[PDB]
Design a protein around this ligand. Structure first.
Ligand SMILES: Nc1ncnc2c1ncn2[C@@H]1O[C@H](COP(=O)(O)OP(=O)(O)OC[C@H]2O[C@H](O)[C@H](O)[C@@H]2O)[C@@H](O)[C@H]1O
Ligand SMILES: Nc1ncnc2c1ncn2[C@@H]1O[C@H](COP(=O)(O)OP(=O)(O)OC[C@H]2O[C@H](O)[C@H](O)[C@@H]2O)[C@@H](O)[C@H]1O
Ligand SMILES: Nc1ncnc2c1ncn2[C@@H]1O[C@H](COP(=O)(O)OP(=O)(O)OC[C@H]2O[C@H](O)[C@H](O)[C@@H]2O)[C@@H](O)[C@H]1O
Ligand SMILES: Nc1ncnc2c1ncn2[C@@H]1O[C@H](COP(=O)(O)OP(=O)(O)OC[C@H]2O[C@H](O)[C@H](O)[C@@H]2O)[C@@H](O)[C@H]1O
Lengths: 83, 398, 401, 400, 401
């Protein structure tokens, strides 16, 4: 019953090289969009912003690429700070 | 007259929310009895407002003798017609069991007169109910667009739409047999058609956009139970000949454990098994991540569906949209100590700090034929009739 | 008598079939009320004799004045209880509306006495129900062998076992609190215990670079469960219960209220408030719908309409296997050949007369009981001796003779 | 008054140190008896006062004949009450075998008086002790914050938190049961619950869709633990204990059973009961001797020799860090610098004066309390500081 | 006889289960005080006699006034010692605290006597304890075979073997110094030898490309260890110890004041200053809870709560095997059926009665001893025959005979 987060997830890290982050995705997700208490947000296109939860802070990143490896999708991002 | 998050909206910022909602993983629709009045149907007031008029000599027993309905409700025309039929069906079994010969023939008349006003109104046409190719007409023109838009707005890999309804009429099957679309409904076979509750887990594929799903929560006119113990589906022509041309044009009700509408014989362990498996699927679709639900035609006079919806806002990925064309009067009435449970229920959530909810009013601006036009066509979809000029040239070749 | 595919099969092939069935990914066991006769349990044919002996004045009204049971069926003790508990509530619901205050009392008096007799038939040990260490006795060893074997014959990587039951008793818990094995049942906490349906997705793990467990699903409730109608289900031990809401039910001669939640009737959907009933049957199907799945059934009389529809619909998948034990099969085979027979015999012989080799039925009277079903299961071999080297030298032994 | 290595600090150098300290591999907490005063508890000297008010006749046979306590300490209220019951149990056990009937009654009658006075002070809710949902009441509001903050900031591949405590009350359990968290305390079962020490090495894991769990070590015992037969120790629920034994204790007089209770560190001479106390200190050392470790203390008076020994020995490892809370630095510095004070003051002072950047002490009276310790701990970002839950549950329950 | 899984098995399968068992990646042994009878040692039953045969007067007080022992037990020699010590240590504190000077002096002699009779029984050679090359005699032979076999059965990459022991004698070191093999016991140095617990993580290696070493864990200490502070423990040689303190104790009538470091009591946590005990049992735990593990137990009478409570919690891991020797296995299945029996035999009959194949128990009198135990372990095969032709050739020959 513990409410550790009021937000759904989008994927999980699988790789770290230099300052470019590599992400894999979940299964049902196709159409660029995610939902939450305030509404709907686009998450997949280049030029968009994405966030990682790291303990007591939040790391912010910007998307660069999008590719295949129902096949397997993959994303690349670059960090620009933290909240 | 469009309230999101407790405060107001405008047409464009809402027509841009709709489009983003239809692109989620799971999409569904819930319809009611007010959606079929543009095709030959009738709401649930007009049914009692006519039973009252045509049969007054029975309206006294129900109130003064057996206590099945109340006076103020009957005068204000606010009675539920499904629970009355269920209770009157359960009063007859006891008498049939313990051999009371007066209370057994007193209820056959009541039930014959009740099963005769809802049938006559669920026939959207009349004596053309037994004929063929009825979805080709003009009344069934927006039902088609609904399905077309719900199917053509998906992507490859994304699931297929779902449809729930409370009617017991044949307006979405006629209108799909014409487009060329296939609906799953649980039944299989032609010469002996039977209910298998796992056919909801199947889908097509080619080996060289075909299907959808339909859930009927209160039954249909073509479902019945035989001298065996199994439910069977048949076609309209066959039903008209067996058990529908006698109901109206005669006085016959002796098969009291035979029909499966509108939610009557739920004390038999074989007929309730088919009602349960629909709510058990509603309450399982409405509990998934990234879900959207559009409601229309439904008056919130049911306790369980409300207790089921209210408990799904606790997940932050479920969104609702509601159409209610009498919202002003309800706010008025509950402003000063009044109103019924439906109005209180809708006003309760009209005032909330929840961006998941959105309410729409305005009379003719919240009707079915406007709900439809708020939905988008794709830009690469064929619309111009460019094949019809050519099917008559093949007929001129007599 | 053993029939696979409608044909005839023998014992030294049955025993080699079971071995290979017990090496599949998903394995399961569904039990009933006959699996608890070797521990002090009764059956529905005995509940009726007890209710006949005691309370002889209500039976009168029940036969004569209300036309609700027949004299023959009574005498021969063939009556059903779940289809009577499901009419004594209709007859009430009608009177609660007609306002017949006297008719509204006999049926309470009857339902109380019908619920009081299926309650003191799940107390396997009568008055020592509240004491401790009841799994150390001799009546609970064939319940330990089952769990030991089911857990033993698993490999590293393959999922854990599930156990489905319809009873109310506590045998499979008394018989695991002894071994020291931990079963998952969906509850959590000690001072305030609560049902959350996400504890069915947990496992164990050692915290380095006691990992035995299993899952238990009761489909009809328990004696240690109760509801305050706040839409929360609370679990309790077996002494608090006896102290607070069971001794009353048995001895105080009161009326009945929803003290504890059990579903003994015939239509479990009429209970429009039960939502824990619906998270178990949502897992039964999710289990049998997987590939590489085997099920063993024992103790079940096949009188449940909502259960004997799922097994039929799971048999259209080529990776599901089922084994069934039914002692009195010849009588059914004859009674249906004579155009008669009940709805459970018509189902078991229809399962026996198939043409697929994924169905197996096992009759033979005492040869189909719970103590033989367990000896039929194998112990594993840990260091697999190929003995291909041994073949060379043990082959020559026969030559000398 | 904040000191690191003798030198002083400011709040903003301190709050920027706590955060750096809470990001380490292993984290821990060690509480005491004062932490439970904001809920309905008491302190060890407020216990002795009430003892010697109501029972002043048995207070002579305890200082004159048997030599069990001293007058200076009895007057200044500096008695250990968990170290006297053990000795009295020893005396009684010896007298049973030596068969001196003139001496068993005079010990039963003065143990029944000590247990009656230590029990009454640990219920925290009086007669509302056997009821349910006692973690919703507002008295238990910061015990939840502590747990939630300790959990909500850990990353994948990092050990879970441990909580050691000297109390023998049920507050942390009452709180976790209402948050929906699981605590491991060494027991397993519901109809017979037994002690298994091999399951402080276990953890949870999810199959397809988890890390909401923590470890709890209680160093002196609990009111829900007892012993029935020679070889085993059992745990029960509050409603069950209250009905079995905890009631006669309060109401009835001259009621004493024997070697049946496991609180506080009393029957430490058997071999089935000390096995339970020793494992805890074992695991305490095994934890406090890892690399990259941090420890916060609050509520502890430093009246124990072994714990101080363990801590001082542990401080040889350069990767161990500590934080302490003592709101009497000023009232002790002088009392110890003039002629001398008491061993607790001397010990706590020896640490203030060192060349260590990995020690820290805090004072200020009401500024070094529990309701303020719980507030120096960082609060996460995504954790919601808003409650749109109750407004929905209210409507769900109003529906009718 | 020989039991497995609660059932019975034969000699020719045990002889091969052992073989298949010694090829795993973790193998260990646990010895007691019986394994040292073939060399000059004694048991606890042979200590009560030597106490009552040389200290007859004190015994009178123990039986008459303080009432600690029964005449029946003394006459029948069924009296424990590790429980008498813990009571003689309890009668003393409550006399020192209430200032009775006539009981301190009467309880300070009994403990000295019990500590002298426990010391004279761990030398194994009497006056020749201080000489050199004592691992050359004919007694310490199977102690050499055991180590040789344990070490020669390891393939590269695998880890070294472990040994666990209670007794204080030096029979495992005398037999490895005479053999050229270096055991590890925690300490390091020669002129000042001192305990560092991170010496259990070291390992030899070679320059270019010996491999013969093992670890020794003593759980109750030795009689070559002494303490001088709270942070240090020191070790000396045998000749050195026999001059310093082990001679006075034996001959002079002094009170033992903590010269050497042994735990012969029943509750070993009352010693609130010992920090070696914990580091030993921690490694015992860490070893018993990893996969692919085998353990042999010999000499142990099953009278230690702390170890019988660890062996039970490790049988919930399905990769851990034990083998247990116990001669008097029949006189314990006899007594425990008719109610009677001490805890020692209860604990092991509980193990005999199980349903897991990961437990084996051996009995049979004088064929469960140490010399028989050693001869059941296998020598390795240096050049492993593929042996296809070996058996092929004899297979054909049989008939012509
Ligand atoms: N042309 C139209 N288009 C859209 N909506 C309309 C139209 N005309 C009327 N309405 C609206 O349609 C609504 C008509 O409400 P009712 O037919 O009484 O309720 P139900 O159809 O759920 O009845 C079935 C229930 O009966 C049992 O109680 C079960 O619980 C079933 O759920 C009004 O609000 C109108 O504003
Ligand atoms: N020692 C034994 N071992 C194994 N089986 C036995 C034994 N003795 C009798 N049997 C068999 O045990 C069977 C008992 O059949 P019944 O008691 O009518 O069925 P139920 O107990 O499931 O009925 C209760 C449920 O029925 C509804 O579906 C509800 O779900 C109820 O929960 C017989 O076939 C015996 O041959
Ligand atoms: N609200 C408060 N917040 C924080 N600290 C407080 C508060 N109120 C008082 N204090 C402090 O709480 C302290 C109370 O100290 P005591 O309860 O006597 O000590 P113990 O509970 O460890 O006693 C058990 C030990 O005694 C044996 O030696 C055993 O070995 C046990 O380990 C004072 O210093 C107050 O400043
Ligand atoms: N030649 C032999 N070979 C093997 N075993 C033998 C032989 N002779 C006798 N035995 C067996 O040796 C057994 C008697 O061994 P015990 O006197 O209990 O030695 P202990 O060290 O356990 O005793 C002190 C314990 O106290 C503390 O708690 C520690 O845990 C200690 O273990 C019998 O079963 C004989 O069959």
């Amino acid at each position: 019953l513990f409410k550790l987060t009021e937000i759904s997830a989008i994927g999980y890290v699988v790789g770290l090289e230099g300052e470019r982050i590599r992400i894999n995705l979940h299964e049902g997700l196709q159409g660029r969009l995610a939902s939450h208490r305030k509404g709907v947000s686009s998450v997949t296109q280049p030029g968009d912003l994405i966030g990682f939860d790291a303990g007591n802070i939040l790391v912010v990143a910007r998307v660069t690429d999008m590719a295949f490896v129902i096949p397997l999708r993959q994303i690349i991002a670059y960090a620009i700070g933290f909240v | 007259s469009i309230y999101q998050g407790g405060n107001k909206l405008n047409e464009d910022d809402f027509r841009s929310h709709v489009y983003s909602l239809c692109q989620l993983d799971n999409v569904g629709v819930l319809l009611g009895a007010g959606a079929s009045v543009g095709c030959g149907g009738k709401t649930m007031k007009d049914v009692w407002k006519s039973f009252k008029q045509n049969y007054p000599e029975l309206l006294g027993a129900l109130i003064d003798k057996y206590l099945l309905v109340s006076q103020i409700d009957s005068d204000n025309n606010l009675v539920n017609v499904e629970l009355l039929i269920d209770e009157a069906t359960k009063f007859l079994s006891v008498a049939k069991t313990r051999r009371c010969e007066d209370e057994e023939e007193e209820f056959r008349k009541i039930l014959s007169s009740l099963y005769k006003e809802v049938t006559k109104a669920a026939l959207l046409t009349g004596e053309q109910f037994r004929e063929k190719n009825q979805g080709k007409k003009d009344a069934f023109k927006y039902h088609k667009e609904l399905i077309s838009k719900l199917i053509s707005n998906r992507q490859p890999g994304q699931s297929a739409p779902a449809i729930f309804t409370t009617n017991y009429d044949l307006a979405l099957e006629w209108a799909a047999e014409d487009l060329g679309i296939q609906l799953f409904n649980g039944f299989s076979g032609l010469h002996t058609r039977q209910f298998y509750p796992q056919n909801f887990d199947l889908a097509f594929r080619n080996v060289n956009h075909y299907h959808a799903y339909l859930y009927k929560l209160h039954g249909s006119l073509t479902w019945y139970q035989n001298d065996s113990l199994t439910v069977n589906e048949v076609s309209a022509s066959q039903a008209y000949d067996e058990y529908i041309n006698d109901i109206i044009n005669k006085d016959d009700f002796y098969r009291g454990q035979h029909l499966i509408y509108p939610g009557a014989n739920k004390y038999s362990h074989t007929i309730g098994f088919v009602y349960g498996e629909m709510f058990r699927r509603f309450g399982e679709f409405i509990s998934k991540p990234q879900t959207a639900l559009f409601i229309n035609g439904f008056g919130f006079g049911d306790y369980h569906i409300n207790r089921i919806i209210l408990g799904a806002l606790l997940n932050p990925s479920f969104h609702v949209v509601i159409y209610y064309p009498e919202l002003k009067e309800a706010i008025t009435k509950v402003s000063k100590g009044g109103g019924s449970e439906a109005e209180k229920a809708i006003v309760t959530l009209k005032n909330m700090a929840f961006n998941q909810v959105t309410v729409v009013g305005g009379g003719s601006k919240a009707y079915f034929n406007s709900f439809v036009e708020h939905l988008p066509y794709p830009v690469l979809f064929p619309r111009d009739n460019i094949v019809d000029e050519l099917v008559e040239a093949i007929a001129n070749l007599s």
